[model samples]
Target: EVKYPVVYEIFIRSLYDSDGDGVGDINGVSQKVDYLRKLGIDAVWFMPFNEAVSYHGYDITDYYNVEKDYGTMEDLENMIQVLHENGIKVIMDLVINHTSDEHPWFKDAVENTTSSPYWDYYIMSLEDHSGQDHWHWKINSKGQKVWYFGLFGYNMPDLNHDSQKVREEVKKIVDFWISKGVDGFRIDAAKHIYGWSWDDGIQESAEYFEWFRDYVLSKKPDAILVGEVFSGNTYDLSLYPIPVFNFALMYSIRNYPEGQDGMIENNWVEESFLFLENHDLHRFFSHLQEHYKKFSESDYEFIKKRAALWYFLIFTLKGSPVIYYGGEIGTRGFKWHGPVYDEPVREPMQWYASGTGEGQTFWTKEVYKNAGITFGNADVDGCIYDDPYDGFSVEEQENDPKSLLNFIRFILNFRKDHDAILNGDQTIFRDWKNLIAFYRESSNEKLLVVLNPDPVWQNSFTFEENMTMILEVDFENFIWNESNVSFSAGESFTVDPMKAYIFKK
Candidate 1:
């Protein structure tokens, strides 16, 4: 049977620079198969690589073509083949809810308002849409003012899913990619579909999403289709046909060990998406620094240790865990506001600590005057600096067995090697008051996972005599408060602050 799926998320623009043009491309990702396989990545959730005018590809200009900076059609095709050869799946970010204003369909619609067939593709109206924040207007060909809906901004105009022609166009786009051997798609901004004044309610978007899901499965039956709901409300997760991102669970994970509700709804723990942080939010390490406030020397250590505990929960729990690039190595990043708003979270991957690696795509350093977002650099506030010696580079951690990278490799392998987590049912356990505990059991085996989310306080818990210790984090710092004998080690437990332990039966 297949192990639980582990998807690695990447914004190719910051992954690796293959052509040396100072940006990451599809071929660049293909060239790193060994790294991915070693990290136990099953599939890659590639952020938008389709043609776009914006630095980020969310505001798509053309749906059928690959982004020029990322690569060409042949490059993408070859990349799909290469990844499959290595036994990895490919999932593209499908952004059909909106299109860049510069898209030919939108442009022609604006320039030839009287006779453009593409005019109906988007939600454009002459009616006064003054009070709405998402409504924006521009002058059309006949010098007539019109309003188009784009939930993000005027640059990205939302498509009219109500139009049969528009729905057919998106279906064609899905067919085009599937024809090129694309395994699946991660539907972007799905919740925003008809989520505005254009429609009285959400039935239109939900119906279209169901139709889209059925269409994709019709073309490629076993294809993966995950939805991006992007909400803290659990009810929104059930709005789509496909399994949606578990942001509510994510919020619960964030506010852990302190007033965290067991918030697992239905089979969400078994079927929903899981992630530490994405391109839109602060990295796990960045969140730690902000919460801990860097009050002392040990605070940095606490931040470093605290970041790994979440991953332990991520890998141990039954869900589709996503590994956002650079997070495995504990990269610290902050999401600034304005022009460079999300740039920090998507900053270049740190291959070498001293900025000395070939094909390292730190273009923001070489190309932009805003020089310090990569490894060994500081943020604009002068408060956050990514230290090279802080073991932040792949080069520095590749050989270190205890590196966060290796620990990630260890836990992932641990997850796969055992059937308990592979095809098991989860039951919440509360052995340790301060530690998060759970039991995973399959017909083949049973396992218990305990984690201390508290960075500074020690965790005291008891391990049953029938249990066998498999692995632990910070074992050297573990102090036993009570024991029957040297062999009765499972009688009780006293692990250091910010640690994880796994036991099996």
Candidate 2:
């Protein structure tokens, strides 16, 4: 009963540029297999690469072919083989909720009207000449018809799952990919499929999931399904789903006012489907600004500290944990415009900023122009910025033992090395203030994790001790004594901003 490994995300177009085309391709990713291998992730979740019109590659026009921007089927096969050779499994983004209007079936349906054989392949409204009832029709501010249903926009059309043809077609594509050696899929917009039957809630749609999951597994039993369940309505979503992303926890931690307190009460600490930041939401660095913005150095250290602690929480939590592509290296991009370039945050991979890859820019020249912050410009030179600045690229912090990269590496390997922490039973320890503590125990091993979100150093923890330190940030060899663990009144151990700890008794 091994717990699932961390799923690393790779937004293909923005990760690395191999051909000097200013866009990240599959070969570009192949260029950095060693980097990922060194980082210690077991799985890779690539954003959809199917032929489509969008830069993100979500709106699929051809399910069987790889997007030209990404490369060919052979390129993908090579990427998968290389990753497999390195013991990394590839999980593709399965965007079955809809297809681009450019898809032949959709194009045919639109051209031939109701007489088209593919007409029933999509959910269309007979009464409303517009595809209004089937999808959310986005009427612009000036009142215009933007006939698309995607949660993101009008280019993507919701597939009619009620039609067996659509369902089986998607099933075929899924099976095709598995046969081609994909390890798993991260189902995109999973909740949207159920939105069709909003009246019955997710009940009917969930049943469709049983069909979807069984169909895929029937082809490949080990293939995994991780869904993008936006709403925390797990009670309903969990019933049908293969595995829903623990939005409940992501939301709580993302917006939780009390920080550590919100984490303890949140279901993610010990429950299912726990994850940190994904491509869709703001990064952990952005979240840290809420509290540490005023103190620059403290903010840098705090973000790194929280990185390790949250990694521990996400790993120790019951379900599989997922990591975004730039997250490991502390990539920060919050806003996305059309294509991948419209947003300021979506920058290119800042690989080796002062060397060959120095001053590298993203596809959007307009956005990067005069930004003044090139990849090379951001790298903190010789003098480690200490607590004040964590720098932007891996080159700057790669040597620092307390760096976020090192912290993530330690926790990932730590979980991998200890079966108890990896697959053990979990229990939350209740306490006060910005503190979250939980214990994980297996057949013969036990590990405890405690986090102090408050700025002060935590000397007094509520958990039973004889606790040996397994991991920490800004502190070394700090053990916990059940009766003696005490904090200087109002002083939380001088923890550098948002710090976390894992202890073993």
Candidate 3:
């Protein structure tokens, strides 16, 4: 098994800005290559950056070119080279399932009727395609109205993947990016390649993904293709030939200990990709406060400590781990009700305590302003949306070893140095049913890990064998333990609340 390095997921626009456009561009990403290297992330999964009309670049106006606001093709190519020089792999978002209404193909198809060669490029029909989430209409040259299937919205019309031309165009798109030395692609909406609805594309979508994977690997045998198979069902997740995000494991972790009973049940784990935060949902830290506790409750300390528990679980689990940008430093993503939805969740990255530093992009603010919603208001979900960076910045956290940024850096580097943790066969220990502990065995090497994901009080665990303590995070979420332990086999002890410990044998 190939031991994959940690993958850092980022919304490019929210990361950093260059050229003083108040927008993030490829140069900005290249500028941060050193930062990523220092943070120990060897792979970067950038969300959609293709030319588009919307703030989020999912609705692509042009697939072959970089978004003008983002940068030119040269900028992207240079950034790829910079990342590669630093031993970082680049996996850009590929949204082939749909295209923007403003795209050439969609525009031509909409202006003309079936006479247009591009008419079949999208799912268009005279009869309404019922059961779709949404249907968009346009007046053809003949002055007749035509409806097209758009699962997401009227602006994003679903592409007809079954069309040979569409498939060939997609192949060319992949070829273009891969030729630029892009290491891989995060296939956007992989579950809907053919399955328009969640229940629709079971078999066809799986076959299409397999074909996509085969082609990607054929061009570059080591291309790391991951899919956004955003579903909790393991059966649906297992269909994709490539690695898909583990929503099951993500949700299970939210439920903790009893849900960990499911971890004891894992093969799917080996092929799965582990993640807690992404561009889709609220920041995991924010989610904890919004769902389990109130943001106004002032329990940020305990909540932040508990967040570390989830991080430890992802690194040790039998899957490739992914970290959304700004998660390490505890960026608060307060989702507010607005027309430009999801903008707050994909807020600007925290670069300073004041959220206003050199190259800090706040483009989302304008997007929200255009939609009539203002920040710093206690309107949505009981969140104030006032603080973008509450003492969580690389500059502020770098000096303090106990800071979240440093803790993440140490764990990432530690995992990188240890091969067994990434490639080992996981066997969850059920000794202390309440404790989420397990052994990762690989060849002649074995490691033990204990995690109190939601340590309400304190929990106890025993070193059942003659093992040496190597690394640990205490109840307060500190990176500790590098000595050969004083505890012998059969030595029992009480582990502090909300901690994770690692041992070697």
Candidate 4:
């Protein structure tokens, strides 16, 4: 088991580019192993890197081969070896639920519906009829009369998990990667993998995941399988043994000061994978800026502080935490509404001091803008689309102590050193109104975390005398006094506005 693992999620195409091809690739990632290692990341979740026709590579055409734009299978093997040497595990995004319509099996199925062995690989409508709504059916390449199901889009056809052959293929994909030293998989669209239509529930989906989990464990017992169950029904998710991304916690943290308090006061934390932002959502810094704009003018310092507080919350909470690629340095991007809606949030990583350098690629920028998508500096309610390199760059923030990137490094390193913060029991305190306080207790250690999320209001909390201040937001403000070593139940200490403190016994 990867106890207290910190997984860094990367959109490979937007990360560092190797060979100066203007597209990020596997070799590029290998070159940056030191960078990730220094940031204290234990695991990396690379977005889909298999052969595909789409730029995103989610609709895979070939499972055994690496995407040409991302280098060769040899490049991937070498990268995995180097990452493993650094004690960092690599997990690829496994998009087994569907394949690109251009895949050979799908093409063969389309051309020879009755004769081909691959005919059952996909869900096809027997009669010539319009497909059901939400299920999203489309005509096949053979003719407009033949229809097939694609829950995501026409280009990405859904696989028929009901077919035994499909299940075998899924296992083959999993085993093939494991053979190449891949640690595990971040299963994409996990809930949608088994269900056929909108009317179908996720019971079959849960069973499929269980089967996959058992199979993987039989091969490599410690292999992790993080599923993407984008549903609100926690009961349904509880059926699976592996961790699932906590969408509820993600949204609550996005709202912060006005967010719900009970997100941490539940049984789900043990099985939850917490994150503030991801490739599919708005950047955390952007969300903080937007929330602040609702009442007051834009303040970059205030935004950075709140975003830091969010990081402190995730690192201290239970379950494993994930950091989106550029999120560490206050990266900002939004989810646009229309054409190329996802391109904005998937922009290139800001690397050099100038931001636009050899590794940075803007191949999608013109394409997205031509399709009526917005880019460049345009302020929407104080959320500006400024040059990512302007102030957010790894080169710029790597040295500054006050930088968001450095703050994240500090918190991550702190969490890495303390087992109680990572794999311990949690106790959330609801007594304070403006404070998000919690205690983490392991067999040998107990630590308390207190956060004042309010931008202007200082908050105080009273606890038992066993607490000793170990770390504070302001090192200068900390002073150890013997008289104050042990405190009464009602004695209080103040947490500066928008600051956090760590206490230990």
Candidate 5:
């Protein structure tokens, strides 16, 4: 069986730049291996690094080579080697659903639609439907006045997966990366790869994923492929044999302390990849700030206290956990709909008080300026700065024991030391008010975890006798109160608001 891993999702362009070229590269990630190791991360999930015309490399012009702006193929290999030497795995983001229209294959398909070998590689229409309201098709460089299917945009033409040649090419791409020592892949837009029509392609998508899972396992039995299903329904994601992201759980975390009814089901816990935020979504801190705009200073402080408990819940859950870059240091970014949409939430990572250091880079600013993208909404200022008093800098947080950074490190290290927390069976205590409690059990060990997310309400719960307190976090400090552990069969202990307790026997 594969060990449950703690993954750190890195958006490379915004993560670091070693060459001071205003862009992050493979060598920048190589320089930060030690920082990740110190954070107790077992694996790194790097966002797309392939050549692309867009700032975000999702629209790949070439699948086999690294993005020229990022680095050379040799730089990627060296980075992988360094990570592997430190016992860390790498999960590359694979975008096979579509290709940049500028790709040679797509260009060839447009020039010779009937006789070209690449004609069927993409979905195309002979009629010139460029003026259609759908806006999913556009004319190519050949001036043939034809329409091509690209759900994302005209620049991203969807591939014809029905073609055996396309499937073989995808397999070849996977094999090439696997040969380079990649531990696994995070399949991008996994469901959208199939079903060109608007109707949900649940069955067809599931079948395709099953084939992908089998083929990938044949290459490396222990390799894992986590899908981006984007659905809250567990049954919708049940067809794929591999793990899928727990989007339902992520939503519950966003509506924390109040929406206990929306908590994830126990059956989905083991197969889920729990995460708080990722490259595409609004950062958790920013969401909280927007949601609680009228809170007083005391209320804001309470919110921060509860946020720590949220991290504790994610780390202690019975699934592979993933932390987005800068999440540990409480980075804040919100999703915007104006010209600079998604660019705001994808701001560069904060490393120091000045926001510049060995691995710190601000590539997003360059992308925004060169691309002439501006914010249309007055609510967003469109600037990136670190407030040292907010404790957003890793340099400041690393020195404070009560900081969010240290709190994350403490729980991750704790989970590493306790096997029951990582791999044991979970039984949730559902009949509770303003609290979440569960038991993690193995043959030799049993542990109880109690969480109180309510900021103003204290919760009390009863547990079995002889339970000893192992770890407790009240958002101020993590205390090892093991020596003061003793409880009667029906004894009830009060959990302070926005606090958590771990007991074991």
Candidate 6:
């Protein structure tokens, strides 16, 4: 069985830049590998850094070369080697669904004769019409016929995976990257590839994927392929031989924030990929409207209560849990509010206590700048600087013990020590509204967790004497008073306000 550890997703251009070119590179990423190891994450999933015209780097022009703005191929190899040396695996973004219109293959198909072998690699039609009746195309103002089939835009032309030549070409590229030491791939637009095929009365695309998974795994069995399926149908996606990213759970949690009642409905897969927030989604705290108001005592207390509850849920869920870079710090930002070149979700690493430098930050200063957040002067107390070119930096929350970063460290270390919690049978317990309880059990060990989301203490719960309390947060401790007893008017024999209790029975 694969040891599941926290996975961190980093957008290369937004992480940190080493050369001061206002873009993050492989060298910049290498600077932070140690920091990630300390945080208890086993792997890093980097967004596409292959040559592309856009910031997301999904529109690939070359499959083999690293993006010029990110770094050269040698730089990528060095980063991979260094990360492996530190016991961290590296996974790259694989966007085989589409290629940039400007790619040599696409350009050759458009400008040259139909005899070109590359013409069959893409979907194109000369018919001119509108709506679904016409083949997808965009005619420029010059009246030139530009044929393309792109789900996102005309600039990204869909690739023909049904073509045997395309399959061999993609397989060679996958082998080459694995040879260079990439552990796995987070497949881009996985489900979308079968859309056209299913519409055309052939399951050829889906069949190709079944073969592709075996081909790649044959090269590396421990290799992971996380498929992106935004829909709720796990049955269709599970048919393919890989783990699918559970977007259904993500959407369900966003709508049902408080308890785990609605969570079971969305737990549609026997094997799934679990994540609270990533490069694509907004921060969980911010989206839930749970944050400190003016950073006051009451506000800080509120933030702490919510943080503790979320931490427990994130770790206890089945499947591997992926953490966004600054998610551990409870970093807040609007979802789609950033410059044309930068995204709001990508923020700098919030190192605890120190600033961004040699002994200061674990990574380089250039890496901090391109991370898409501004950094304040070292002398300033509570002010946060805004970097127009970059996004945000970590200098703001370095000192607070109540910071989200510290909470994450505690949970990761604690979970690492408890094998039962990591791999065990999960059972939901009966509780009132605003109260969630669950149990984890492995052969010799059994642990119970109770989370109370109520602001005020719940006085309705009953307690038994044989149960022993192991951990308590934001609540008064209660030693077993008798064999059986009911709760008091304002104090439950065992309860707290928005807290979790770990117990042994």
Q: For residues 1-505, write the lDDT of model 1, one tens digit per residue.
A: 5445789998999888898887888899999988998898788999999999987899888888999999999999999999999988998999988999999999887777647787899887777788787898888757887778888889988888888999888889999999999888999987778777443345566666788888899988888889887777666676667877788767765555232334443225346778878888888777767765763446655565566667777788876789999888888778776445677678778888664468787556542335434333444212133545556789988987767787788778667787887777787776343566788889898988777665566766666547766776762342212112231535667755666777787
**Tens-digit lDDT string for candidate 6 (156-218):** 778887788988999998998999999998888777775653244124444656888899989
Tens-digit lDDT track of model 3 for 385-407: 43534566667777787777877
Candidate number that wins on lDDT, 1 or 5 = 5
User: Across residues 1-505, which tens digit of lDDT does each residue of candidate 4 receive?
Assistant: 3466899999888788888776888999999999999899989999999999988889999999999998999999999999999989988899988999899998877777757788788887557546475344434566644467888878888988889999999899998999999888999987887665643658878788878888999999888679987765567667666788877667766655443445455325456777888888888888877886732335666677667777777788877889999899878888887755676777778787665666665556555546654435322111134353466788888998788888888778777778787668887874243577888888767888887666566677777656776777742221212122434455787876666777886
Inter-residue clash pairs, candidate 4: none
lDDT of 1 at 92: 91
Measured with C-alpha atoms, the lDDT of residue 383 in candidate 1 is 17
Candidate 2: stretches off by over 4 Å = 125-152, 196-200, 233-237, 257-262, 269-271, 290-298, 336-342, 355-361, 366-390, 457-469, 472-505
List the candidates' TM-scores in order: 0.88, 0.81, 0.91, 0.90, 0.91, 0.79
Judge candidate 2 at residue 124 and give its lDDT.
49
- lDDT (0 to 1) per candidate: 0.75, 0.65, 0.77, 0.76, 0.76, 0.64
Give the number of colliding residue pairs in candidate 5.
Answer: 0
Please provide, for model 5 over 441-475, each residue's C-alpha lDDT reduced to its tens digit, 9 standing for 90 to 100.
76667888888776667878777667888887766
Off by over 4 Å in 4: 134-144, 196-200, 266-268, 294-298, 366-384, 431-433, 456-460, 474-491
The candidate 4 region of ten consecutive residues with least summed lDDT is 475-484
Better of 1 and 3 by lDDT: 3
What TM-score number comes out for model 4? Answer: 0.90
Residue 152, candidate 1: C-alpha displacement in angstroms = 1.0
Q: Alpha carbon lDDT of residue 64, candidate 3? A: 83
| Backbone clash numbers for all candidates listed | 0, 9, 1, 0, 0, 9
What is the C-alpha lDDT profile of model 2 across 1-505, one tens digit per residue?
4556777888888777777766678877887898888787888999898998877787899999998877789999999999999988999899888898778887666666567777788654334345444454433344443343444455676787888888778878887898789998888877677564434446666677787888888888878777776676547545655887787777766665336454555444223566667766656666656545633545555465555556656776656788876677665544434333334344455555442363233554433443433332423221111112336566765776656676676667766776676668877774445566678788867876666655554535544545556666442222222222432323333333345666665
- Best by lDDT, which number? 3
